[PDB]
Amino acid sequence: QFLRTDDEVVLQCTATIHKEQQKLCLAAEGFGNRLCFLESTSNSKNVPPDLSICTFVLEQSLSVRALQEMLANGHRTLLYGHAILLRHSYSGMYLCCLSTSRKLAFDVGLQEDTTGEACWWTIHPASKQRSEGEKVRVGDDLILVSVSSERYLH
Amino acid sequence: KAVWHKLLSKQRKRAVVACFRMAPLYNLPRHRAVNLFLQGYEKSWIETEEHYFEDKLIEDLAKPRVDPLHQLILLFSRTALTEKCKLEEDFLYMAYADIMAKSCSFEEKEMEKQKLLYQQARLHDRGAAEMVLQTISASKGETGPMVAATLKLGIAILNGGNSTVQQKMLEYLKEKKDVGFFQSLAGLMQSCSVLDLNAFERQNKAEGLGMVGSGEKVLQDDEFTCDLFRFLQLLCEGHNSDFQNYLRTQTGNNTTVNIIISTVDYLLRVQESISDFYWYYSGKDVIDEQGQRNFSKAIQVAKQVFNTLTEYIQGPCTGNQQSLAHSRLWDAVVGFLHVFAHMQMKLSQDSSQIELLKELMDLQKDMVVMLLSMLEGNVVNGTIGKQMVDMLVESSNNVEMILKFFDMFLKLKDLTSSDTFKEYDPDGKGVISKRDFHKAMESHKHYTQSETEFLLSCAETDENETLDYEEFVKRFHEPAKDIGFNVAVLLTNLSEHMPNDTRLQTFLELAESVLNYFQPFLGRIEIMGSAKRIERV
Amino acid sequence: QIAEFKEAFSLFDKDGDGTITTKELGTVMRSLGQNPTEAELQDMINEVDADGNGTIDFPEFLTMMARKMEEIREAFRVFDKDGNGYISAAELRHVMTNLGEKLTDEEVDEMIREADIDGDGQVNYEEFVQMM
Amino acid sequence: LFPDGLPGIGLSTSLRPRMQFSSPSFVSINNECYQYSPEFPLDILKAKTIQMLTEAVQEGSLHARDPVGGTTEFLFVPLIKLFYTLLIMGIFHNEDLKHILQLIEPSGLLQMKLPEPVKLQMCLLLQYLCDCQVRHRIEAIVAFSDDFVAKLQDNQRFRYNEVMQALNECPCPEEIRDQLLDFHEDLMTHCGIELDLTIRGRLLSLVEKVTYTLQQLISETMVRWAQESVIEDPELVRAMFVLLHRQYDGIGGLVRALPKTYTINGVSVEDTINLLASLGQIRSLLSVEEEKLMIRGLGDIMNNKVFYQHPNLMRALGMHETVMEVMVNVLGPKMVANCCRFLCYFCRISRQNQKAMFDHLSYLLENSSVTPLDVAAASVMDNNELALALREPDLEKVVRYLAGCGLPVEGERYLDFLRFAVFCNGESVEENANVVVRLLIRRPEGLLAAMEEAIKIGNAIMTFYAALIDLLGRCAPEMHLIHAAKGEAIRIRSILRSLIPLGDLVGVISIAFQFCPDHKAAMVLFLDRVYVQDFLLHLLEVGFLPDLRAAASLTDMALALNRYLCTAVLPLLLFAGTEHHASLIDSLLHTVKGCSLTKAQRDSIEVCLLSRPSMMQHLLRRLVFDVPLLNKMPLKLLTNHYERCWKYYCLPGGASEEELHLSRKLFWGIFDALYEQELFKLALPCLSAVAGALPPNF
Ligand SMILES: [Ca+2]
Ligand SMILES: [Ca+2]
Ligand SMILES: [Ca+2]
Ligand SMILES: [Ca+2]
């Protein structure tokens, strides 16, 4: 039903490009890839996408209180109004903003260390119906912003 | 030499800035001095008491034909039933309403009880409270001073939990049903409050830089909201079970806005605000009076709203707790415990925080009394009881904290007079020792010395480090023990009532010392509390 | 009288123009111990500012200084304690704590001694002009 | 207040403005009578009114089936109000009233039963009676006030010295600080001490004097009709309870009355009246080409000198608000900005005047014109507390106005307002500097390439982005390691540069040579407050080349000269170092305004410390090309300061030291050519030092 820590999930978009609801999911490789990218899950009947570079582990998810503590140095539920620590399941690395541009946005890929704001992504539900202060459930809509660059998961 | 030049430079500097404003003192202007004297005389002297006259004037007004007071009430009613698409100032309301609201060891208590009842008759026999109700339906979400006047009058009527008024108001709702009324209740509940500490940092930085009419920050008149909730409480004290079910259900109109869940997530929002006030104040360990005062205000808010919460469920009319079974209350309580555990440590430090500690422990007390009132309709394995189990489960660590916290002054209450704790250093005067006291307590096969260090937080810290073997000790003795008795009652009721909960077995033995401490003090019976069950109590 | 206020003026005429801006005022008061606000510091100025050039000119400064009280004799009276012809060593090191400045034992013992030309172990009434 | 009472006041020292009516002139005064009314012989009628009513009461004493218009209400209602109006205009001098009151007193009129609407008239009369009575109670305390502070100021501030001159008064720790406070604060505990010098017994009597016939009966009159005569027309019934409440709280009326009063000297009393007459003139024209008569009056209020002297009174008038709703009553057309122009003038005259205007931007922000937004910015122009006092969601509406700017001109004024909103003191408030970027996360406005594209292809979008470059560098985190030793302002410091490169040389060097007098400096602070000597040369002679010599070429560049005398004083912290001295000495040759040149003259000797130290003594001979020409007096103050520069750079000295001694002989020769002479009397020692430790329209 809901979502706590240490449970396994993917993200996905359904980008309707050329009016095709392309069920493209996130995909970062590691071990020689320092970037995330996409992965189509629409044609499951003939091209099964790989899952391993798409699974992501909810290591932690607190508010500003705990966050400030960590920077100033088994089922915690995950809340609209939290920034979380998210690991890549396969590589073990930690997804974050990357400080290059390839326009004036910022790149997206793995890193090791949990220091800095980069490994933190604040959760906002993109509806008035949901709001901050309650658990994230099965299959909810959400908006993630960086904490280093404070730009959107775009 | 050079230090002489430094002293003369600072000397002439102090003399010059003295010459800037010392002798300038109301100095020139006759007109301005007169004017400012008038302003001070205004701000000081006017400001007095004449104010014994009004109830007398009520008694003059309660005189014969129609009574003129009743004419006035009729005026305000007809004023209320005008449809002005919004509400307005009308200062004469703002005079006369609180004029009436001005107008409200055993035997004498009964006597003044009857005199108060006579006053309450003396108004509401003239149909007084209906226009209060009308006005409150009349504005919608607007929180004007008009609304404050109405709420003051409504509580001043309903002060004793007068049943008669509750009947009248229910019947008023019955015939002339106003979805707009409870609509207005929800809207008035809606914005209504929260402390917003960024503004606190703005003003505290301003006290860094402005040296100034402050205090407007605190939840934007918290007090009015306290009055609203006390009005809700004194609406249903006396177990107006019909009224409790109506406030759930509101059936006679078209629609229903269940105000219960409204005040639930309201106080959830209040909880959120105070929990982030902790996440602010988690590190700085010293609070000056401003934040302390804002704490105390919000504390009274929490106390009031918990009393409303009880009074919804206190007559165990099932639908309240049925709705509240699916409330979002539980996690807010969990975060409350998370507040309490960490708060009590840093509050339990010095001469300052002790008052605020009393505040927290007392709200803590009747907070748990709330879920005691929740608890009372259980059968064998409480479904609701299991909700209490599960919300207890996630609140483990703080529960360990608070149980240690009770164990501290509990074992203080144990050792506090044994002569291997009393005649240890002295015979006894109160002045005993630090380290002999310390090794006394430690030599009692009793403490890891962490507990002693927390006990040696201050314990006197006055020149001698001998404590007061009674005063600090009596500060600890009772004043955290009732709550432990309450939660003991609670968890025993759970475990006894719903058995076979393994984690609950862990929880109960996990501070079993206080339970067996309180076994001299509980009492239990069994009765048939009109559900024809053996309802033990 | 005349120059003793201009010496008091040029001590506070930091920019050296004959006019005292309001930033000049809190600059001294934050080196004198205080930390006043500009919305207060202007209010130290504007009542003195009767000519209304925005700042404080010396002829308005002069007559303002004239009604308070030489500055030198009471400055020595902060220095001089009882009147035994000299300022004793512990007496002079007690003068500095009234303006709040702290000291050690070594620093002013040479400052007496770098002023103690005659060598009497104290600072007499004469040595307020030899050091100044 | 009392003979050891009756509302026949003789004195009546209030103001209650004058009534000089126009004659019924039937000549050319048509729009020149224009002020009052046709007039008429009043005091015939005041005889008639007493003649009428006292008869009419005695004619109504029988209460016959007679009465004139059929009813008493046909009779009495057109009488009493007509009298009451005639009561209002300040006639019936008390012996007139003495008979008139004894009609009303007898102590009869109230003793009659009367119908409904007459007492609706009649209640206003006695209501009017309490007011002048309260005025009489008010005017009484004025006389108590005058001598008493005259007793008090002559007591304490004199003796306040006599404690401090007994203390010294150059020391002021606490005892002088006891009577060192604000003026109201000095009056605060001074009055409040007596609430817990024997002269406070006079006050102590006075409060009890001003505690307290009519106040009895006024209550008793209502409860006649309140009892007996169950009443229709609730506004009548409303009106009665006022007076009863006004009876049983007479005190609270004094409370609200107290911040209306004022005391002045006898000279200023005229400039009250004409202003006061023209005041209510504006209050008169509230009820409506429908602006033209106002506009002349506005400046008259401005033209008062008794307009600054009692400023809280005008605030206590609230007359601004009378303008304010009128402007709101406009906003539902050309003369609008006058009142605006009054308003932004108005609030600005004091901090507390700015204070009361602060609440009204909340409206006023919604009201763009093309000005009212000046006035919206006027009450937040400077004040540091007010920078904290404001709120965020308003600013979104400001940037909503910027959000629609997807073309334009019109965004350009919000930024100037917001530039006031975040800096206000020379001091960037970080709270406002925090919030301004957050909207820009969700709102954008190769854009910086287009700046020189505007240099060819109406002047506005040059300036429009030039405000944007001001405010961003205005919303820097801090000015120090305050910014560095910090948290997450560093995160915006990246945002301060993840958005902008250096880049700006589209404007930096380019607009520094050809807008030009301002917008180059619109860049400077941003690179300063956000972004050692590599960037000197990387940006050297950028403007500093064409600026330094063009002094005789006035005139926007000669206007532009002090507009960048801020600029070179900012970086005051290897071949082209002489090229900076080329850019330096020519402006020093141009300076051979002036105070801003004296600000730029502070950029001269500070460069001498950072001065390859060989290039300083060589370029000082260019000063020696003018140092014999000293005795250009500004040049004579310059090289005398630069004479210490070779006295500074002498330690590396110990080609040009030969004739420098001849220039020192010419410095002896300038001393052979002659306070202001002390500008060289110290400089000869530096001329001795430059010879000494170095030896250790052209
Ligand atoms: Ca100046
Ligand atoms: Ca001046
Ligand atoms: Ca001695
Ligand atoms: Ca000596």
mmCIF file with all atom_site columns, C-alpha atoms in Angstrom, chain D residues 294-399:
data_model
loop_
_atom_site.group_PDB
_atom_site.id
_atom_site.type_symbol
_atom_site.label_atom_id
_atom_site.label_alt_id
_atom_site.label_comp_id
_atom_site.label_asym_id
_atom_site.label_entity_id
_atom_site.label_seq_id
_atom_site.pdbx_PDB_ins_code
_atom_site.Cartn_x
_atom_site.Cartn_y
_atom_site.Cartn_z
_atom_site.occupancy
_atom_site.B_iso_or_equiv
_atom_site.pdbx_formal_charge
_atom_site.auth_seq_id
_atom_site.auth_comp_id
_atom_site.auth_asym_id
_atom_site.auth_atom_id
_atom_site.pdbx_PDB_model_num
ATOM 1   C CA . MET D 1 294 ? -8.648  69.148 -5.712  1.00 0.00 ? 294 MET D CA 1
ATOM 2   C CA . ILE D 1 295 ? -5.395  69.658 -7.534  1.00 0.00 ? 295 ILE D CA 1
ATOM 3   C CA . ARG D 1 296 ? -4.789  73.240 -6.517  1.00 0.00 ? 296 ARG D CA 1
ATOM 4   C CA . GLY D 1 297 ? -5.470  72.360 -2.902  1.00 0.00 ? 297 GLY D CA 1
ATOM 5   C CA . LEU D 1 298 ? -2.950  69.544 -2.861  1.00 0.00 ? 298 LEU D CA 1
ATOM 6   C CA . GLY D 1 299 ? 0.032   71.771 -3.356  1.00 0.00 ? 299 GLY D CA 1
ATOM 7   C CA . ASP D 1 300 ? -1.262  74.217 -0.766  1.00 0.00 ? 300 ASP D CA 1
ATOM 8   C CA . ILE D 1 301 ? -0.930  71.441 1.738   1.00 0.00 ? 301 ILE D CA 1
ATOM 9   C CA . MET D 1 302 ? 2.524   70.891 0.301   1.00 0.00 ? 302 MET D CA 1
ATOM 10  C CA . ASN D 1 303 ? 3.146   74.624 0.436   1.00 0.00 ? 303 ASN D CA 1
ATOM 11  C CA . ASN D 1 304 ? 2.524   74.721 4.143   1.00 0.00 ? 304 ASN D CA 1
ATOM 12  C CA . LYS D 1 305 ? 5.575   75.046 6.273   1.00 0.00 ? 305 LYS D CA 1
ATOM 13  C CA . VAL D 1 306 ? 3.284   73.957 9.051   1.00 0.00 ? 306 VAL D CA 1
ATOM 14  C CA . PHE D 1 307 ? 3.317   70.600 7.349   1.00 0.00 ? 307 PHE D CA 1
ATOM 15  C CA . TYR D 1 308 ? 6.570   69.163 8.599   1.00 0.00 ? 308 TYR D CA 1
ATOM 16  C CA . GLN D 1 309 ? 6.461   70.537 12.083  1.00 0.00 ? 309 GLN D CA 1
ATOM 17  C CA . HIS D 1 310 ? 3.535   68.482 13.370  1.00 0.00 ? 310 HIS D CA 1
ATOM 18  C CA . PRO D 1 311 ? 3.759   65.478 11.091  1.00 0.00 ? 311 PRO D CA 1
ATOM 19  C CA . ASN D 1 312 ? 2.086   62.912 13.285  1.00 0.00 ? 312 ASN D CA 1
ATOM 20  C CA . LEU D 1 313 ? -1.017  65.089 13.353  1.00 0.00 ? 313 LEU D CA 1
ATOM 21  C CA . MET D 1 314 ? -1.416  64.675 9.621   1.00 0.00 ? 314 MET D CA 1
ATOM 22  C CA . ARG D 1 315 ? -0.878  61.032 10.267  1.00 0.00 ? 315 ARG D CA 1
ATOM 23  C CA . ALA D 1 316 ? -3.340  61.415 13.130  1.00 0.00 ? 316 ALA D CA 1
ATOM 24  C CA . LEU D 1 317 ? -5.593  63.045 10.608  1.00 0.00 ? 317 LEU D CA 1
ATOM 25  C CA . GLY D 1 318 ? -5.230  60.053 8.369   1.00 0.00 ? 318 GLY D CA 1
ATOM 26  C CA . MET D 1 319 ? -5.708  62.502 5.509   1.00 0.00 ? 319 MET D CA 1
ATOM 27  C CA . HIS D 1 320 ? -3.476  60.368 3.313   1.00 0.00 ? 320 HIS D CA 1
ATOM 28  C CA . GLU D 1 321 ? -6.067  57.670 3.484   1.00 0.00 ? 321 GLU D CA 1
ATOM 29  C CA . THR D 1 322 ? -8.594  60.207 2.332   1.00 0.00 ? 322 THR D CA 1
ATOM 30  C CA . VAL D 1 323 ? -6.388  60.551 -0.692  1.00 0.00 ? 323 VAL D CA 1
ATOM 31  C CA . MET D 1 324 ? -5.924  56.818 -0.842  1.00 0.00 ? 324 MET D CA 1
ATOM 32  C CA . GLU D 1 325 ? -9.485  55.670 -1.277  1.00 0.00 ? 325 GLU D CA 1
ATOM 33  C CA . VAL D 1 326 ? -10.073 58.569 -3.621  1.00 0.00 ? 326 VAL D CA 1
ATOM 34  C CA . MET D 1 327 ? -7.358  57.085 -5.747  1.00 0.00 ? 327 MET D CA 1
ATOM 35  C CA . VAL D 1 328 ? -9.114  53.775 -5.266  1.00 0.00 ? 328 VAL D CA 1
ATOM 36  C CA . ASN D 1 329 ? -12.233 55.635 -6.243  1.00 0.00 ? 329 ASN D CA 1
ATOM 37  C CA . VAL D 1 330 ? -10.338 56.713 -9.306  1.00 0.00 ? 330 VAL D CA 1
ATOM 38  C CA . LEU D 1 331 ? -9.393  53.103 -9.941  1.00 0.00 ? 331 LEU D CA 1
ATOM 39  C CA . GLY D 1 332 ? -12.701 51.771 -11.153 1.00 0.00 ? 332 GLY D CA 1
ATOM 40  C CA . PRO D 1 333 ? -7.794  59.739 -14.955 1.00 0.00 ? 333 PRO D CA 1
ATOM 41  C CA . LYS D 1 334 ? -5.054  62.117 -15.934 1.00 0.00 ? 334 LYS D CA 1
ATOM 42  C CA . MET D 1 335 ? -4.674  63.891 -12.606 1.00 0.00 ? 335 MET D CA 1
ATOM 43  C CA . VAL D 1 336 ? -3.931  60.593 -10.868 1.00 0.00 ? 336 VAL D CA 1
ATOM 44  C CA . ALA D 1 337 ? -0.183  60.890 -10.556 1.00 0.00 ? 337 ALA D CA 1
ATOM 45  C CA . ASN D 1 338 ? -0.438  64.193 -8.683  1.00 0.00 ? 338 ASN D CA 1
ATOM 46  C CA . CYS D 1 339 ? -1.800  62.471 -5.648  1.00 0.00 ? 339 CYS D CA 1
ATOM 47  C CA . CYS D 1 340 ? 0.736   59.739 -6.218  1.00 0.00 ? 340 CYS D CA 1
ATOM 48  C CA . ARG D 1 341 ? 3.336   62.482 -6.334  1.00 0.00 ? 341 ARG D CA 1
ATOM 49  C CA . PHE D 1 342 ? 1.881   63.853 -3.141  1.00 0.00 ? 342 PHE D CA 1
ATOM 50  C CA . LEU D 1 343 ? 1.829   60.402 -1.588  1.00 0.00 ? 343 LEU D CA 1
ATOM 51  C CA . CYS D 1 344 ? 5.401   59.360 -2.282  1.00 0.00 ? 344 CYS D CA 1
ATOM 52  C CA . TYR D 1 345 ? 6.390   62.781 -1.092  1.00 0.00 ? 345 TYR D CA 1
ATOM 53  C CA . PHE D 1 346 ? 4.137   62.376 1.892   1.00 0.00 ? 346 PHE D CA 1
ATOM 54  C CA . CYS D 1 347 ? 5.235   59.126 3.522   1.00 0.00 ? 347 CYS D CA 1
ATOM 55  C CA . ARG D 1 348 ? 8.844   60.011 2.925   1.00 0.00 ? 348 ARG D CA 1
ATOM 56  C CA . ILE D 1 349 ? 8.865   62.976 5.280   1.00 0.00 ? 349 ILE D CA 1
ATOM 57  C CA . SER D 1 350 ? 9.445   60.712 8.262   1.00 0.00 ? 350 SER D CA 1
ATOM 58  C CA . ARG D 1 351 ? 10.068  57.090 9.099   1.00 0.00 ? 351 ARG D CA 1
ATOM 59  C CA . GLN D 1 352 ? 6.855   56.846 11.090  1.00 0.00 ? 352 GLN D CA 1
ATOM 60  C CA . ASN D 1 353 ? 5.099   58.445 8.171   1.00 0.00 ? 353 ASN D CA 1
ATOM 61  C CA . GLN D 1 354 ? 6.496   55.701 5.985   1.00 0.00 ? 354 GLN D CA 1
ATOM 62  C CA . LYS D 1 355 ? 5.311   53.291 8.671   1.00 0.00 ? 355 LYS D CA 1
ATOM 63  C CA . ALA D 1 356 ? 1.617   53.921 8.418   1.00 0.00 ? 356 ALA D CA 1
ATOM 64  C CA . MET D 1 357 ? 1.714   53.710 4.654   1.00 0.00 ? 357 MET D CA 1
ATOM 65  C CA . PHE D 1 358 ? 3.173   50.243 4.733   1.00 0.00 ? 358 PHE D CA 1
ATOM 66  C CA . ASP D 1 359 ? -0.108  48.407 4.958   1.00 0.00 ? 359 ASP D CA 1
ATOM 67  C CA . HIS D 1 360 ? -1.463  49.629 1.750   1.00 0.00 ? 360 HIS D CA 1
ATOM 68  C CA . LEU D 1 361 ? 0.892   48.276 -0.862  1.00 0.00 ? 361 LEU D CA 1
ATOM 69  C CA . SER D 1 362 ? -1.186  45.126 -0.332  1.00 0.00 ? 362 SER D CA 1
ATOM 70  C CA . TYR D 1 363 ? -3.800  46.920 -2.262  1.00 0.00 ? 363 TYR D CA 1
ATOM 71  C CA . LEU D 1 364 ? -1.465  49.160 -4.221  1.00 0.00 ? 364 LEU D CA 1
ATOM 72  C CA . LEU D 1 365 ? 0.669   46.402 -5.733  1.00 0.00 ? 365 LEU D CA 1
ATOM 73  C CA . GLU D 1 366 ? -2.301  45.241 -7.747  1.00 0.00 ? 366 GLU D CA 1
ATOM 74  C CA . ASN D 1 367 ? -2.442  48.559 -9.525  1.00 0.00 ? 367 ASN D CA 1
ATOM 75  C CA . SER D 1 368 ? 0.123   48.934 -12.299 1.00 0.00 ? 368 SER D CA 1
ATOM 76  C CA . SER D 1 369 ? -0.222  51.995 -14.517 1.00 0.00 ? 369 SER D CA 1
ATOM 77  C CA . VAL D 1 370 ? 2.694   52.313 -16.961 1.00 0.00 ? 370 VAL D CA 1
ATOM 78  C CA . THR D 1 371 ? 3.018   56.408 -10.687 1.00 0.00 ? 371 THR D CA 1
ATOM 79  C CA . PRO D 1 372 ? 1.323   54.353 -7.924  1.00 0.00 ? 372 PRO D CA 1
ATOM 80  C CA . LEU D 1 373 ? 4.057   51.776 -7.926  1.00 0.00 ? 373 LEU D CA 1
ATOM 81  C CA . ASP D 1 374 ? 6.480   54.563 -7.089  1.00 0.00 ? 374 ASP D CA 1
ATOM 82  C CA . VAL D 1 375 ? 4.296   55.154 -4.073  1.00 0.00 ? 375 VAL D CA 1
ATOM 83  C CA . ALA D 1 376 ? 4.240   51.421 -3.507  1.00 0.00 ? 376 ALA D CA 1
ATOM 84  C CA . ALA D 1 377 ? 8.007   51.575 -3.502  1.00 0.00 ? 377 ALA D CA 1
ATOM 85  C CA . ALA D 1 378 ? 8.010   54.800 -1.540  1.00 0.00 ? 378 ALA D CA 1
ATOM 86  C CA . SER D 1 379 ? 6.933   53.333 1.777   1.00 0.00 ? 379 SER D CA 1
ATOM 87  C CA . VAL D 1 380 ? 9.605   50.631 1.590   1.00 0.00 ? 380 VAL D CA 1
ATOM 88  C CA . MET D 1 381 ? 12.374  52.842 0.296   1.00 0.00 ? 381 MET D CA 1
ATOM 89  C CA . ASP D 1 382 ? 14.941  52.402 2.974   1.00 0.00 ? 382 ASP D CA 1
ATOM 90  C CA . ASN D 1 383 ? 13.803  51.161 6.293   1.00 0.00 ? 383 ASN D CA 1
ATOM 91  C CA . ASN D 1 384 ? 15.587  48.128 7.579   1.00 0.00 ? 384 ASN D CA 1
ATOM 92  C CA . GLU D 1 385 ? 12.856  46.902 9.872   1.00 0.00 ? 385 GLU D CA 1
ATOM 93  C CA . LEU D 1 386 ? 10.377  47.294 7.064   1.00 0.00 ? 386 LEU D CA 1
ATOM 94  C CA . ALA D 1 387 ? 12.571  45.088 4.923   1.00 0.00 ? 387 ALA D CA 1
ATOM 95  C CA . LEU D 1 388 ? 11.893  42.429 7.475   1.00 0.00 ? 388 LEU D CA 1
ATOM 96  C CA . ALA D 1 389 ? 8.324   43.498 7.925   1.00 0.00 ? 389 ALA D CA 1
ATOM 97  C CA . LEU D 1 390 ? 7.097   42.693 4.448   1.00 0.00 ? 390 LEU D CA 1
ATOM 98  C CA . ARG D 1 391 ? 5.889   39.417 3.027   1.00 0.00 ? 391 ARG D CA 1
ATOM 99  C CA . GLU D 1 392 ? 6.667   37.073 0.202   1.00 0.00 ? 392 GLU D CA 1
ATOM 100 C CA . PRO D 1 393 ? 3.400   36.307 -1.699  1.00 0.00 ? 393 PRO D CA 1
ATOM 101 C CA . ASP D 1 394 ? 3.045   39.902 -2.770  1.00 0.00 ? 394 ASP D CA 1
ATOM 102 C CA . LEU D 1 395 ? 6.361   39.591 -4.522  1.00 0.00 ? 395 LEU D CA 1
ATOM 103 C CA . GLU D 1 396 ? 5.025   36.738 -6.596  1.00 0.00 ? 396 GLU D CA 1
ATOM 104 C CA . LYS D 1 397 ? 2.357   39.084 -7.900  1.00 0.00 ? 397 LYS D CA 1
ATOM 105 C CA . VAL D 1 398 ? 5.198   41.446 -8.695  1.00 0.00 ? 398 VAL D CA 1
ATOM 106 C CA . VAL D 1 399 ? 6.858   38.719 -10.678 1.00 0.00 ? 399 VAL D CA 1
#
